[PDB]
Design a protein around this ligand. Structure first.
Ligand SMILES: CC1=C(CCOP(=O)(O)OP(=O)(O)O)S[C@@H](O)N1Cc1cnc(C)nc1N
Ligand SMILES: CC1=C(CCOP(=O)(O)OP(=O)(O)O)S[C@@H](O)N1Cc1cnc(C)nc1N
Ligand SMILES: [Ca+2]
Ligand SMILES: [Ca+2]
Lengths: 675, 675
């Protein structure tokens, strides 16, 4: 039949791509081609408009299987061709060895690190539910799309997927439909060696609906029926068990050897002849398959055409909501939204930056509807919920509504990070955030790194940033954490010192379109600084205290800026004149012009950094570094600062030693380099 | 009764400790005191010998509840007193705000980061099973101890605990008995807001046995009976559901407010009078409670006395095993074990460092019985299994035996990391390891950091270290990873360049007693270096190529050392004389004498670092840094190195620019500092 021919075409495109690269993963593509065919036939999408907001989304969580995804995208006439398939896994191609949303049209998210994609799918589905609750009206189903996810045994073993699956079940996300590739093979062989749990029973325990397809190597009728069944269960996410043979059709089917290396040439020949293809030909695309797939595209395009007319009629019936929706689909924040950001003067009281963050959120959430966010069971500690908002919960629980704006993630940092990526991936200008203690952002590193690689404007509200948290002690006190994330490409790591800097950090985080943000915030109160402003802090680094005859410049962040200012006064009594630089975000600073940066960190003066965590990275900006390169302690925070000599006198002593060390030396800016 | 008085004593010690600190967590201690009393009465332990190898182990996974643990340890006469309780959460005390194994007698592991302790308990139980299978003989139950773990809702939400619980069920670890504090309260309030899964059904799906105690606020008879029941189920780990009231007895019982802040003074008074204590008194220890607890200690000490005689008789009946066991309990490796380490010359073939690692393991595993380890579903990629060894599996599966040495962790990096910590915590000189790709060690950061803080000699076999892995692309290629772990205190991060350096890295990792190791290993082949040796590489950094008239020194690691040597030859043709330093472990190097370090990185010569990952940290050792501070690419590895100019000519160009940049300047070693 044409459907059988399409499935064979998909299988053989994937195998031929792996063969051409002499690299990659043929097994899961062979096993999942029937399901991919069936799911894409049910999906609504436009290959010529990858951003249609009411499209169904597809996520390949088992991202190593991407020859399958690329084959689907090629067959459906996305901006990806057979010539791109021939360049699978080749430097610079549009067909990288794992899918990247920045590079691959029709890749919603970046997968490959196992477990991430299913969590991203939870976030896409969460966003869709929130979006539909916000905009849909009687006779106006603006948003009614589904989220389809493929995942394998590896994703099911990774703890992040358990976190997200527990939460998705709690949230009753009925438009999420996931498909488990139940092939009983991973890299180490049979799943009997390490993965003998009853997956189905576990998913029932989370509140998911289950459909089992016992012959998913052939039974596309049953796969389609499973989708129809899942769509009828509106208050539970569904897991469809696809019992498949890894490498179906290969001489090596059902073995670990077919997972992750090219097939033998003779194996590819017998695949082709068994399925009616020419064993001498590669990258075959039968015209009847193209015709069948084109019919579905044309139908989908007529659906989008009608949606566009629905949207026009919505703008007439609901003028304010329609304009808001239009603005969001245009990627624009509300005009002058930033006028809501709080501004402070040096006469205002000291405030912890976690509390300044609460105040910002309280002002901007009512003004910017596309802001939603939550906390990983730290709401009263991170201060992430604006008073008067409702939680995102299914109304059936009585605990919230899908129109709500605040997410109770539970103690699930890693899934929170990956769900945030999915909310961003949904689109519609969502600017979403997640709170935890800074030290436990590290639990979510797998997802955080993908925020950076995927260029998603997500925000971590990362409170209790240092030994300043006090008594909880060294298991809670960051040392390495900022260095880790600053060393990752494309992460803005804001460590604001005061009220104006906190507003600048949020301006950056909310305006972002391509860069994730981590906001490192204090437990403890900090003074409002003389010389701070949103304008200056928006440059990432700025001269807080200018001293034309400086003997030294002290560069600091966060809680250590006030310390530097107090040290400047001690130094004055020692006959040493200091300037102070505040560096609330190193990435933003790095992006400023060379001349601006040199105005902050000039030649001809020693520069000392002060930050109560690792000294890694700080030599970019300083000649000498005063940091904390050992674990912390359990005690009252001021006593810990004293123990480690993070006091005005301790900073002044090191500043004086720095001045002495450079006596008789020629000093150039740390910004200078040989290449 | 005396038992009732003991429970009240525990509750009130915990509340009084929190009160004295005006900080900490009274709720779970109040709720779990009956269970703690019951479990400790069943446990075999010696407060005067915390290292008795046949003790039962206890782990408080909900580590914030540590006022409970400290109260138990004080009551039982560990090296912890009421005076220490009065110093709870105070700087320098033996009663930190979360338990630390380095600081607290009777704390087996360091907890506080949720989810870790239960996984550590899985590792203690895994080790006990392996140890018993190795040493027990008829009439000689050398090892027959249990592992008791308390955990809360937060631990159950963290994905790491799902990973470890799936694996523990697969492994049929019948001597593991965990207790869930089912109090339905976390920081954000009721668990109804975020955690509505059927926990019991999930644990059944993993293959655990369940016992439910519906009135765990009072029913110590049922808690004791649950332990007895769990001990009869020898082929399943057991979860005991303890339905408790958080803060039991407080006016604020059953509320989130009792979780994490001191009780009001009037509340403490009414607790005391309800339970027959003097409301004017704090830190009361009734002598009848001490007497009862002392009776159990005395009985346990007679059990250990008899075990010592059993061990003496074992040494007579089984002379070789007995001597091996004695050596391990003395903390000593086999005499001259390191003579098994492979040695290479520059005439030997190029080898990838992952393959060199396989060869090391193959030589040392037969010689050092306390080495066990595994991989997170990457055995044929990491090359972590020695041919001819058997996997650690329950014999009932037919897939291995508990005497086996190789663990199939599945796709569970985070739990693997925390399980490794538990295996180390068991003791008996275990030197255990875990393989994954370097980029996915990051999934396990929560546990890795605790290896460092806990001072456990665990080893990550972290292969596919860089863009050298090629086609899998940027989702798999480390950039930030070494900087992250090098910035963490107390992590040795070895990046060996060749065969001799790989042997030095393993010598360090296996000899370690207090420092975790990460071995960053290549996919791709590297040449054997002229000038390398185990002796020199054991110093962490060494002069590979000495040049008395050097214009520049190039310092490099791993795959970039050979690149530096090739660049030296290009530079010679440009009239520039270079030396080369290899820096296989920065931590080991840092620990050498100042004079040794200066002999490697002297004054008076520019130093350029080369390493194909982040430049963070490298200014400790260099004036200029050539690194990779952007994400990678999907293509054949040599083409990626060329793209980024990590070629002999690209290094030489940057070296020449470095020489030019320092013309006319006075240069001192990067090792010099102002303070
Ligand atoms: C183990 C592993 C794989 C097997 C999947 O086994 P699974 O059953 O999911 O795939 P199948 O055998 O094709 O059906 S792929 C490769 O990613 N990898 C390394 C890998 C490990 N850890 C993480 C976080 N991401 C990864 N990418
Ligand atoms: C959320 C959170 C807690 C509530 C536990 O809720 P749980 O039900 O386990 O404790 P109970 O309410 O006392 O019964 S504690 C504090 O650790 N914390 C922050 C916290 C967050 N993430 C990680 C990895 N470790 C942590 N430590
Ligand atoms: Ca599989
Ligand atoms: Ca709880």
């Amino acid at each position: 039949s044409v459907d059988q021919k399409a499935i064979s075409t998909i299988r053989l495109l994937a195998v031929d791509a792996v063969a051409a690269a002499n690299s990659g993963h043929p097994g899961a593509p062979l096993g999942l081609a029937p399901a991919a065919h069936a799911v894409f036939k049910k999906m609504r999408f436009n290959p010529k408009d990858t951003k249609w907001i009411n499209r169904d989304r597809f996520v390949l969580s088992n991202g190593h299987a991407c020859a399958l995804l690329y084959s689907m995208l090629v067959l459906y006439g996305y901006d990806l061709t057979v010539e791109d398939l021939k360049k699978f896994r080749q430097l610079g191609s549009k067909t990288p060895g794992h899918p990247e949303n920045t590079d691959v049209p029709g890749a919603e998210v970046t997968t490959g690190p196992l477990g991430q994609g299913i969590c991203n799918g939870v976030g896409i589905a969460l966003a869709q539910a929130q979006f539909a609750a916000t905009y849909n009206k009687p006779d106006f189903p603006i948003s009614d799309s589904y989220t389809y996810v493929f995942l394998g045994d590896g994703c099911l073993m990774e703890g992040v997927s358990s976190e997200a699956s527990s939460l998705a079940g709690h949230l009753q996300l009925g438009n999420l439909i996931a498909f488990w590739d139940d092939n009983k093979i991973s890299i180490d062989g049979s799943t009997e060696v390490a993965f003998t749990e009853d997956v189905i029973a576990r998913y029932k325990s989370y509140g998911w609906h289950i459909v089992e397809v016992s012959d998913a190597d052939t039974d596309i009728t049953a796969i389609a029926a499973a989708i129809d069944e899942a769509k009828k269960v509106t208050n539970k996410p569904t897991l469809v068990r696809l019992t498949t043979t890894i490498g179906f059709g290969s001489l090596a089917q059902g073995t670990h050897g077919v997972h992750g290396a090219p097939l033998k040439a003779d194996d590819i020949k017998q695949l082709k002849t068994k399925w009616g293809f020419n064993p001498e030909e590669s990258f075959a695309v039968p015209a009847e398959v193209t015709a069948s797939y084109n019919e579905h595209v044309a139908e989908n395009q007529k659906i989008q055409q009608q949606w566009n007319e629905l949207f026009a009629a919505y703008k007439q019936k609901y003028p304010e909501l329609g304009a808001e929706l239009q603005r969001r689909l245009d990627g624009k924040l509300p005009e002058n939204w930033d006028k809501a950001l709080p501004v402070y003067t040096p006469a205002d009281a000291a405030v912890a930056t976690r509390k300044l963050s609460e105040i910002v959120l309280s002002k901007i959430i009512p003004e910017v509807p596309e802001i939603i966010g939550g906390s990983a069971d730290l709401t009263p500690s991170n201060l992430t919920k604006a008073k008067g908002t409702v939680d995102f919960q299914p109304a059936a629980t009585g605990l919230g509504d899908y129109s709500g704006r605040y997410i109770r993630y539970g103690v699930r940092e890693h899934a929170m990070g990956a769900i945030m990526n999915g909310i961003a991936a949904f689109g519609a200008n969502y600017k979403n955030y997640g709170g935890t203690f800074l030290n436990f952002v590290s639990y979510a590193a797998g997802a955080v790194r993908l925020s950076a690689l995927s260029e998603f404007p997500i925000t971590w509200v990362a409170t209790h940033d240092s030994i300043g948290l006090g008594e909880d002690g060294p298991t809670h006190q960051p040392i390495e954490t900022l260095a880790h994330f600053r060393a990752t490409p494309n992460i803005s790591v804001w460590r604001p010192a005061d009220g104006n800097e906190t507003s600048a950090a949020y301006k950056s985080a909310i305006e972002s379109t391509h860069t994730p943000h981590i906001l490192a915030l204090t437990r403890q109160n900090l003074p409002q600084l003389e010389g701070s402003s949103i304008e200056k802090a928006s440059k990432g680094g700025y001269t807080l205290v200018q001293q034309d005859k400086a003997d030294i410049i002290i560069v600091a962040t966060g809680s250590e800026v006030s310390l530097a200012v107090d040290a400047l006064k001690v130094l004055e009594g020692q006959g040493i004149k200091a300037g102070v630089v505040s560096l609330p975000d190193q990435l933003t600073f790095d992006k400023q012009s060379e001349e601006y940066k040199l105005s902050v960190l000039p030649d001809g003066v020693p520069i000392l950094s002060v930050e109560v965590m690792s000294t890694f990275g700080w030599s970019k900006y300083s000649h000498q570094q005063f940091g904390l390169n050992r674990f912390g302690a359990s005690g009252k925070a001021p006593e810990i600062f004293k123990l480690f000599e993070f006091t005005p006198e301790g900073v002044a002593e090191r500043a004086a030693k720095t001045v002495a060390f450079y006596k008789g030396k020629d000093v150039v800016s740390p910004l200078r380099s040989a290449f």
